């Protein structure tokens, strides 16, 4: 087309609000105050192509997983209305997170004001994905113990809301605060250690280990840590500047970790419901 023509630009000619990662030397979309140009660029090759498509495809995938889960036979669950509500909250959190992410990455180059609005939605979505993922997990883990289940839901929701509020602060979106962002969101996911200790103290090592909670929880903690480390450190583009502009830079790998992380988490809580089904609702 001969409408809204553009060429990628080197990192040095970018305005300030577009200078996120100076290890990405070329292939940047120039500032373009057109939503038409921004959404057309999804089919173009630039520094944001992989970021858009990993969470655009991840978003539809979780939306198909969420719809299909909603229509599963009611016989398969001990309490289908309640169980579908808890999973529904997880799917909702995953879909809002992935949707805000792919939209923000698409309209990032629009203007300073649009970029500022969508970066706050992008950050807020991570917290929503984390808050939502605790709901089915605390539900099956504290199935017979209602007082800790209720308390830990207040805590993850209160910590999540504080992360959403901190995400509104304009300093938080600056490149200097990259490590602060990794720390805030990592802390939020790692705060799951508190209800995990409570579960292990209440039920013991054999129970925590027999049910695959322990193996699955270690993997989740691993995905969080390596995912946060890649993001904070800008690995591997730090080691090959100008060689990862389009493919496999840190943000792109991190996006992959979020989708994988959300699927492994779904798999873990899905096994907990199958186990709760085998033993029934008896306490």
């Amino acid at each position: 087309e001969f409408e809204g023509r553009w060429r990628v630009i080197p990192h040095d000619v970018l305005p300030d609000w577009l200078k996120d990662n100076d290890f990405l030397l070329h292939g940047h979309r120039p500032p373009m105050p057109s939503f038409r140009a921004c959404f057309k660029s999804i089919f173009r090759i630039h520094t944001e192509t992989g970021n858009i498509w990993t969470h655009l495809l991840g978003c539809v995938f979780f939306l198909c997983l969420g719809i299909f889960y909603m229509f599963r036979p009611n016989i398969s669950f001990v309490a289908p209305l309640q169980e579908k509500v808890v999973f529904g909250l997880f799917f909702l959190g995953a879909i809002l997170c992935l949707s805000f992410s792919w939209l923000f990455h698409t309209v990032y180059c629009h203007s300073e004001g649009v970029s500022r609005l969508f970066s706050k939605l992008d950050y807020s979505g991570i917290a929503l994905l984390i808050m939502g993922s605790f709901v089915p997990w605390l539900y099956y883990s504290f199935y017979c113990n209602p007082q800790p289940c209720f308390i830990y839901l207040i805590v993850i929701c209160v910590l999540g809301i504080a992360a959403i509020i901190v995400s509104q602060w304009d300093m938080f979106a600056t490149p200097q605060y990259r490590g602060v962002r990794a720390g805030v969101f990592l802390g939020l996911g790692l705060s799951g250690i508190i209800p995990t200790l409570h579960y292990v103290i209440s039920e013991g090592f054999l129970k925590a280990a027999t049910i695959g909670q322990i193996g699955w929880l270690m993997l989740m903690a691993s995905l969080y840590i390596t995912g946060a480390a890649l993001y904070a450190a800008r690995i591997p583009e730090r080691f090959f500047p100008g060689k990862c502009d389009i493919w496999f830079h840190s943000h792109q790998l991190f996006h992959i970790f979020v989708v994988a992380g959300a699927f492994v988490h779904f798999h873990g809580v899905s096994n907990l419901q199958e186990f709760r089904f085998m033993i029934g609702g008896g306490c």
């Epitope: 001969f2 409408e3 809204g4 023509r5 553009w6 060429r7 990628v8 630009i9 080197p10 000619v13 979309r29 120039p30 500032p31 373009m32 105050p33 057109s34 038409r36 140009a37 203007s111």
Partner: single-chain antibody
């Protein structure tokens, strides 16, 4: 540090051909597209076309498809423009202007004057007002109307007499580097404005708007501003 240095003036006879040089420095030559602009004496700016030094591809305004030919010399970071079968209508100042991703022009050459003498043997941009005179300290507003939606792909330029234009505002509201805060751009769709708060003696000159949404790129007729 970015400079675009053009070849000297040319006095040629009808039917001849001229090649204008544009030597680019202070950046990686292939990284940005180069555009060519014509300005007839006492007239508005006209877009000739654009050239991509990397791909070697060019897009011409249909009006000049048979008049201009763009070439490059990647080694010497130079763009060329051949003008053929010259007539009296071709008497003008020709500029090379550099893009930065989208076709708003942050960098311009000094211009090459081509004089044709025999002595020796599409989006319309409507600018308003066409001219105005105001005192120092006052506020002025120049408007720009486009015949079609240009999706905020608009730039404002100031041109002093005998000089090349210089960008003030791009992407409808983005103040260009080094430009005073007195200048502000606004608008959306088809309607745009350039506001000059607290007029200064250096603010006299011609003002032009430019759309870079659709090819061929076009300029408004200009607003001549005089300071009392």
């Amino acid at each position: 540090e970015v400079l675009l240095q053009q070849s000297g003036p040319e006095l040629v006879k009808p039917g001849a051909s001229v090649r204008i040089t544009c030597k680019a420095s202070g950046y990686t030559f292939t990284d940005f597209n180069m555009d060519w602009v014509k300005q007839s004496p006492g007239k508005s700016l006209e877009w000739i076309g654009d050239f991509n030094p990397n791909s070697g591809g060019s897009i011409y305004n249909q009006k000049f498809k048979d008049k201009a030919t763009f070439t490059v010399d990647k080694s010497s970071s130079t763009a060329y423009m051949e003008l053929r079968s010259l007539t009296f209508e071709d008497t003008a100042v020709y500029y090379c202007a550099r893009e930065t991703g989208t076709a708003w022009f942050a960098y311009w050459g000094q211009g090459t004057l081509v004089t044709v003498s025999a002595a020796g043997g599409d989006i319309q941009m409507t600018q308003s007002p066409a001219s105005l005179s105001a005192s120092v300290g006052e506020t002025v507003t120049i408007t720009c109307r486009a015949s079609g939606n240009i999706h905020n792909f608009l730039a404002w330029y100031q041109q002093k007499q005998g000089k090349s234009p210089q960008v003030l505002v791009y992407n409808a509201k983005t103040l260009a580097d080094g430009v005073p805060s007195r200048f502000s751009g606004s608008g959306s769709g088809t309607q745009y404005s350039l506001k000059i708060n607290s007029l200064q003696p250096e603010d006299f000159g011609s003002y032009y708007c430019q759309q870079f949404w659709s090819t061929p790129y076009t300029f408004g007729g200009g607003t001549k501003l005089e300071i009392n």
